[PDB]
């Protein structure tokens, strides 16, 4: 009975409500607010020729890779702005990219519905395609390297899959969302991960078990970005609703509401700081705000680009943050 | 200054930049078109006449055309529609004949309106094809008209209704400076490339005075 399903929903909602006391509106009020924070651009990468949709930092915290619709991948050197590599893609339609933790592999995909793996360290000194993971039906949305031989993907099929790169076959699938899935982020322990979907809800998953453990809700519209907390105990959610929220993975409830009246536009990406105090989030209004993690105060703002910030990432050491926009320019902020 | 290895790295970066710039200049010469039909429209017919995205490029009178038909994508289009924002023009197909299968005309009209009124994608010209002339012509005289559209109040056949539905489609074109071309195909004509060529040359001319606005 669907009425039994909604009865279970009602009783679990009642239990969650019974397990809530804060608010989170009077607590944390006594700490020293960070106030305004000044940020200044340091470098500008001007090699691309069209829109850029995704970028990722390396583990060394110096190299990064960016993807653009011109059909090319560039491996930049942030310290010197030197183009280490230029990779021509088979399909000019790309929507995501990822950097392997070991630094030997880089992956990218998009509307072609397949994920291509590129080997950087080759005997001949030129990059090559290692695997063409083609199991999904819809467009690729996000990719992440579990290790040197394990990659997770999310596509338009409302599903996610875990791959065995050398074998080239899916080993696990997730089929619970019932709605297009758009972004995902891996926990620091590399055991659990979360994904965002257009169904106005997000679900936590278990990598080994291959089954959902918790489903989060209470959000008005689509979700476009998610990222874990540094301690792997919480996460924040992007949206086209022009709002951000963060939930506790153990308490299972919404905590913060990052809403300002002056901004009514979609949110393209989010990220945290090394200590998690600073919340970063792109916007469709061409500038990305900076939010206090637990004060809900817009601490600062970053001018530019022209239009429109679509992807950003923070280094592992936290030293700097990079942002990208449809104007084919990358910037490093410190 | 900088060491020898850094100098070599800088030289390599300059070579990469030059190669990339040359590739971009070469690529920016061709014209990109998007084919966005609806359901059983004659998009397949047009593409054959010439599991994800499909690209087929052809050269006509030393002009390179790249055509895309995102038909396999079953996901919602409001996402990922923004990818084809910098496209020269788009192609739309309907029929004429089929208008009672459900109706089909209402669905096509609302889809056309939705795609023609977007926050972006607002200043791209549209090429509209009315394929399957013969089936529509045979359908009219035996089962006139009806039409599903009420308050028609016009001559029964034939160019009357043809131009009536045509005008109904050129309607709901709010923005200025953006033209809608049209042509009716019998599914056996061998001049669709000619009309596409004429439309694209007209569009590029319009773009030229646009810059020299004049607007």
């Amino acid at each position, epitope marked *: 009975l669907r009425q039994e399903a909604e009865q279970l929903k009602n009783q679990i909602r009642d239990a969650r409500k019974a397990c809530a006391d804060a608010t989170l509106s009077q607590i944390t009020n006594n700490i020293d607010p960070v106030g305004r924070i000044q940020m200044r651009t340091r470098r500008t990468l001007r090699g691309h020729l069209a829109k850029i949709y995704a970028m990722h930092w390396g583990t060394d915290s*110096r*190299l990064l890779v960016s993807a653009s619709q011109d059909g090319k991948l560039i491996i930049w*050197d942030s310290y010197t702005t*030197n183009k*280490v*590599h230029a990779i021509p893609l088979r399909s000019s339609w790309v929507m995501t990219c990822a950097y392997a933790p070991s630094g030997n592999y880089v992956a990218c995909g998009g509307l072609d519905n397949i994920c291509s793996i590129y080997n950087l360290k080759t*005997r*001949e*000194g*030129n990059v090559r395609v290692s695997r063409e993971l083609a199991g999904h039906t819809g467009y690729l949305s996000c990719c992440r390297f579990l290790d040197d031989n394990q990659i997770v993907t999310s596509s338009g099929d409302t599903t996610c899959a875990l791959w065995d790169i050398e074998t080239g076959q899916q080993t696990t699938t997730f089929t619970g969302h019932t709605g297009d899935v758009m972004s995902l982020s891996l926990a620091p322990d590399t055991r659990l991960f979360v994904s965002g979907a257009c169904d106005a809800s997000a679900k936590l998953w278990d990598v080994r078990e291959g089954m959902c453990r918790q489903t989060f809700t209470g959000h008005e519209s689509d979700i476009n970005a998610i990222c874990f907390f540094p301690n792997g105990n919480a996460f924040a959610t992007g949206s086209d609703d022009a709002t951000c929220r963060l939930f506790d993975l153990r308490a299972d409830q919404e905590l913060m509401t990052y809403s300002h009246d002056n901004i009514i536009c979609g949110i393209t990406s989010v990220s945290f700081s090394k200590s998690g105090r600073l919340l970063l989030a792109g916007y469709d209004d061409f500038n990305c705000n900076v939010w206090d993690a637990l004060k809900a105060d817009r601490a600062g703002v970053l001018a530019g680009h022209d239009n429109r910030v679509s992807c950003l990432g923070v280094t592992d050491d936290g030293m700097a943050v990079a942002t990208g926009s449809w104007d084919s320019f990358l910037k490093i902020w410190n | 200054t900088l*060491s*020898a*290895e*850094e*100098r*070599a*790295a800088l*030289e*390599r970066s300059k*070579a990469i930049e030059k190669n990339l710039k040359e590739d971009g200049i070469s690529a920016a010469k061709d014209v990109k078109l998007l084919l966005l039909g609806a359901g059983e429209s004659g998009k397949s017919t047009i593409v054959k006449q010439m599991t994800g995205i499909v690209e087929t490029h052809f050269t006509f009178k030393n002009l390179h055309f790249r055509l895309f038909d995102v038909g396999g994508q079953r996901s919602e289009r409001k996402k990922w529609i923004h990818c084809f924002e910098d496209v020269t023009a788009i192609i739309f197909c309907v029929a004429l004949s089929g208008y009672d299968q459900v109706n089909r005309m209402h669905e096509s009209l609302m889809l056309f309106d939705s795609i023609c009124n977007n926050k972006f994608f607002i200043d791209t010209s549209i090429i509209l094809f009315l394929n399957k002339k013969d089936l529509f012509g045979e359908k009219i005289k035996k089962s006139p008209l009806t039409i599903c559209f009420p308050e028609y109040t016009g001559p029964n056949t034939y160019e009357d209704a043809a131009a009536y539905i045509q005008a109904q489609f050129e309607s709901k074109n709010r923005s200025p400076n953006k033209e809608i071309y049209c042509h009716m195909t019998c599914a056996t004509d061998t001049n669709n490339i000619q009309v596409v060529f004429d439309a694209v040359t007209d569009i590029i001319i319009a773009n030229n005075l646009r810059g020299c606005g004049l607007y």
Partner: single-chain antibody
Amino acid sequence: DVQLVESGGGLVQPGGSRKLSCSASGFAFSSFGMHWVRQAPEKGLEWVAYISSGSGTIYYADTVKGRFTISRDDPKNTLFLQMTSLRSEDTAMYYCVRSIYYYGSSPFDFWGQGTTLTVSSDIVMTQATSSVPVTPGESVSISCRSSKSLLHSNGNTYLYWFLQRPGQSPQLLIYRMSNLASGVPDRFSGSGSGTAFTLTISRLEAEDVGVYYCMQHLEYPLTFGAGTKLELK
């Protein structure tokens, strides 16, 4: 796979002119900068020439300047070193090396085979002694010294180590004195100060016997050190 073959050697009277050609096969030859290295008939090693990837930069040593030129043609996959006016001491064995420069590269990784030949300031490296008695299964260290400190402002200490097995072309071991070349046992370890450097070999086997060298890449011309040969006392 990757392999360089060359055949231009011969016996020419003093001041003669010849051409040297080593043909590449098994890699993107057009994307690598190539060097030439001369091994005198008795002992020793010294840098000779260098041509960049796009032939947009060429360097020479002193004795080579004005008498030899280097050229390439990417489509044919060939490297040319022009012998002209050669003097009495020019007789030696020659190798053509491959090298690519970017962040975290491994230049001088692979060497050619060699082609014989008969006829008729700069940084200085010091090593000593040229022969030290060693036996299998016991550790050993080899030291190399320079005049100017190699520590650049970037923090990269440009020092390279090579091993030449008896009767075989050398191979790279350590680059930048802190990394390890691909396909090398982990027992090797590069360490040292800004002017003095050493090695560390553990679990020595009969395959490690040979003659080693220390080289710098900080500033041209590239200068090789003396050879320290290991034996089986």
